[PDB]
Write a protein that binds this ligand. Structure first.
Ligand SMILES: *[C@]1(O)C(=O)Nc2c(C(=O)OCc3cccc(C)c3)cccc21
Ligand SMILES: *[C@]1(O)C(=O)Nc2c(C(=O)OCc3cccc(C)c3)cccc21
Lengths: 304, 304
């Protein structure tokens, strides 16, 4: 027993991280097969970032201007193309450590692990969630751009995020591995404010089920609710609306614990209305929303 | 910017995990050079765990009774010995993925990453701290025994924990890599209650410095205190006493932020006495104590 914020083992992704330098800008790249993926702003100087014309800046670049280093060895760049906000640098050597992989575009509320890197070297791994406003609350310092987010299904890595930006409010923005930003963000140092960071309701319910499974049951009340009544309270607390699809996805946790989804919703409603009263749930004084229903099942069952 | 509970990249440790089976008991082992380390209770049946005589149980075991599997290949066991609460199984093949490593016995309050495994396969990685009562609050299901805790210093892995037990209260106990339990715990299914889980004061102060560095400054008050005055309040709140060694270790964070250690202590004192008043610090409604001063520096500077 015990429930922890857990990241996927990062080894498979550590074997893909490379350093990419263009001129005086250095960041991280992802080396899969004979292609290195990195944020296109590797071609910008800090001055260019204020209002960059990427196509124009790229005209002044050749294969030999992109310096790719894997460990302490240099990779030969034999091609380069821009796809949305990422550059794909074709190299002459397929990464020998390429794991089975996919590129997926996740939905808000979905969680993933990030392997924070600096100069192509992994520094740490943590678990994130794509917020409903399409930002992520990460930990990224200068040099961390190009670090990726991913999920693992047995031996296949689904890459879902690449780090590009930090908004003026300290939250983070990035793209999927096709270079499309999540949300309305752009790779330009301009006024980009995030929308409401609402709470991922279905994740909070999944985490309340994990708490019950691990012994924390004090918050279970004697009430039930309906989706409509619950959602009126959820709107008031800046919680995402709960749908019948969310109820269906919580079905296995409802079955394992014997607590109906709408009963857990009523417990959540009372926690929102009355507060925690100085108490904790799974060692937290706030309702955790960065565990999906699948993460709860995986951790509570032992998926490897 | 941004501050996250971060684990070390786990690849170096993933390359060491093996499955160890003795009879009908299966758990995880750590394969370093030509030795596989695993909890000695791999020789017990669930019945034996109530009052095991390990020396006696081991007499009925031979090299061929310990089945070690690395991936889908079997390792040949050519020797076996018991060292405290671990078995060391000498194998005929040195692990080709053995990283640079050390075995260290950590002190309470020190943090480390755990790579949770099942049947020798990594499932996830999370950050832990050795509690002042020598337990850890982990996430461990049946089959996770033998999963290890570690820290990384550039390319050297310092292994500090091996999982062995879950106490009746759901908290965890284990040993260093020489087989010595942390705390007074034993590998027997008996009444073992943990002592007071006090808060690691020096870690809370380090995390308050991380909050200041990342913009969360609301809790900074207009007061100072002394170690003696602070410790009187800390005792009342089940916080570990703060020593001059703790003050010295916080020195670099004090220097970077310009906030004297005893000023941060006074801010912490007011947070303990007045509560958070529904506010959060680095997205938490309670004071986080599972970041050491070194972890804060490492994350706030980008150590790889
Ligand atoms: C990523 O490429 C990265 O790793 N750093 C980074 C920055 C960055 O460091 O911003 C500092 C900066 C930039 C522009 C103007 C000033 C005053 C400061 C920015 C964007 C993308 C990345
Ligand atoms: C580790 O070896 C491990 O992975 N599991 C485990 C257990 C365990 O599964 O406990 C279940 C159990 C044990 C004894 C009696 C009953 C009723 C149930 C126990 C100790 C160590 C380990």
């Amino acid at each position: 027993s015990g429930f922890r914020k857990m990241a996927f083992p990062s080894g498979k992704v550590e074997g893909c991280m490379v350093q990419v330098t263009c001129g005086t800008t250095t960041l991280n790249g992802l080396w899969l097969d004979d292609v290195v993926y990195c944020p296109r702003h590797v071609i910008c100087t800090s001055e260019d970032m204020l209002n960059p014309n990427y196509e124009d800046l790229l005209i002044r670049k050749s294969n030999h201007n992109f310096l790719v280093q894997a460990g302490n060895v240099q990779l030969r760049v034999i091609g380069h193309s821009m796809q949305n906000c990422v550059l794909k640098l074709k190299v002459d050597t397929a990464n020998p450590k390429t794991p089975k992989y996919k590129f997926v575009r996740i939905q808000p509320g979905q969680t993933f692990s990030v392997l924070a890197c600096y100069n192509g070297s992994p520094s740490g791994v943590y678990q994130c969630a794509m917020r409903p406003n399409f930002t992520i609350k990460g930990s990224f310092l200068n040099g961390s751009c190009g670090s990726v987010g991913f999920n693992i299904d047995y031996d296949c890595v689904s890459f879902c995020y690449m780090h590009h930006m930090e908004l003026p409010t300290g939250v983070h923005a990035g793209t999927d591995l096709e270079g499309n930003f999540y949300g309305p963000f752009v790779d330009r140092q301009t006024a980009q404010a995030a929308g409401t960071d609402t709470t991922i309701t279905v994740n909070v319910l999944a985490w309340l089920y994990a708490a019950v499974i691990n012994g924390d049951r004090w918050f279970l009340n004697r009430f039930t609710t309906t989706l409509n009544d619950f959602n009126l309270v959820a709107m008031k607390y800046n919680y995402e609306p709960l749908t019948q699809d969310h109820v269906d996805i919580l079905g296995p946790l409802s079955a394992q614990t014997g607590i109906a989804v709408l009963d857990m919703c009523a417990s959540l409603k009372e926690l929102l209305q009355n507060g925690m009263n100085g108490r904790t749930i799974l060692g937290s004084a706030l309702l955790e929303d960065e565990f999906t229903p699948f993460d709860v099942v995986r951790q509570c069952s032992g998926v490897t």
